[PDB]
Write a protein that binds this ligand. Structure first.
Ligand SMILES: O[C@H]1[C@H](O)[C@@H](O)[C@H](O)[C@@H](O)[C@H]1O
Length: 302
């Protein structure tokens, strides 16, 4: 009966008059890193163990996609310098497949350049993304192309909405889709106006924090969102954090503590506004502990 019991289609159960900003959305941090298998690399660079499709079926709707231009017509998915063994086309193919099966969901796709392009590349990262992906015949109608800076669920059903972390772009649809882009502060909680002043973006992205500082920073932004009804404010709250330098200090081990702690907090807040919460190891369950994705989903007041 709870929304989280059918995580494949939870957005379909909402009033589609809601602006995406007002929806409490589970996101996955460094979403494409599920491919990593090397133990030492995985400690710091692996943030997920489910693939794109499984993340989606688990209720994830915000995807943190990082890229590297590897050819003049190709973007490879990366975690910084580390190649995640697939190209951007895989994600978009998966997103299309999923949105076809679940046509009343919407997906927000964050796009960012994570590494310098291959030496043979002659075009900018943004140009390659814009020409060969956003305006690719296969995906052109898949992306949201409306002029609403604050789209509703109804306008974006079956669509991917760009969340632009590329810097300036000539793309005209999506969060931060203008020639200014989003002014992103390093390792900080910050707020900045985007979309020519139409939205106020409020972000907690203190990725270098130690454990207690990070949990506090997440709870602080959660508390702000809880008392903020403004449709024109958008909240992005990263539960993810940098690893230590060892197997027991992995991103996984951090998430195994942070995710249940925040999930418990949300559960014990009832249905209230949380914003968009971006997590490591989305869908990873631990017996006897509250699930962060499920609780974000269920926090949506219906
Ligand atoms: O969430 C953070 C952030 O968005 C930064 O740009 C990046 O450098 C960190 O590694 C990342 O994971």
């Amino acid at each position: 009966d709870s929304l989280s019991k059918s995580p494949e289609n939870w957005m379909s159960k909402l009033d589609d008059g809601k602006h995406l900003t007002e929806i409490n959305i589970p996101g996955s941090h460094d979403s494409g890193s599920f491919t990593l298998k090397d133990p030492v690399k995985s400690v710091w660079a692996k943030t997920q163990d489910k693939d794109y499709l499984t993340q989606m079926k688990s209720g994830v709707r915000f995807f943190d996609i990082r890229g590297r231009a590897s050819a003049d017509n190709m973007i490879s998915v990366h975690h910084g310098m580390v190649y995640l063994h697939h190209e951007l086309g895989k994600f978009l193919d998966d997103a299309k497949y999923y949105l076809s099966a679940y046509p009343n969901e919407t997906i927000v796709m964050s796009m960012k350049k994570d590494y310098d392009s291959d030496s043979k590349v002659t075009k900018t990262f943004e140009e390659i993304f814009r020409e060969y992906y956003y305006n690719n015949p296969q995906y052109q109608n898949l992306f949201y192309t409306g002029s609403n800076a604050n789209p509703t669920l109804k306008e974006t059903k079956g669509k991917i909405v760009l969340f632009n972390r590329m810097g300036g772009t000539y793309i005209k649809s999506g969060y931060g889709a203008d020639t200014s882009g989003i002014q992103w502060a390093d390792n900080a909680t910050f707020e900045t106006k985007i979309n020519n002043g139409s939205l106020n973006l409020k972000v907690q992205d203190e990725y270098k924090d130690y454990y207690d500082k990070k949990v506090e920073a997440v709870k602080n932004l959660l508390a702000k969102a809880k008392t903020d009804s403004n449709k024109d404010n958008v909240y992005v709250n990263f539960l993810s954090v940098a690893s230590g330098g060892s197997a027991f200090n992995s991103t996984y081990n951090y998430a195994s503590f942070i995710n249940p702690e925040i999930a418990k907090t949300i559960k014990a807040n009832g249905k209230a506004r949380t914003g968009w919460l971006i997590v490591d190891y989305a869908g990873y369950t631990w017996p006897g502990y509250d699930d962060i994705v499920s609780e974000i989903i269920d926090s949506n007041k219906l």
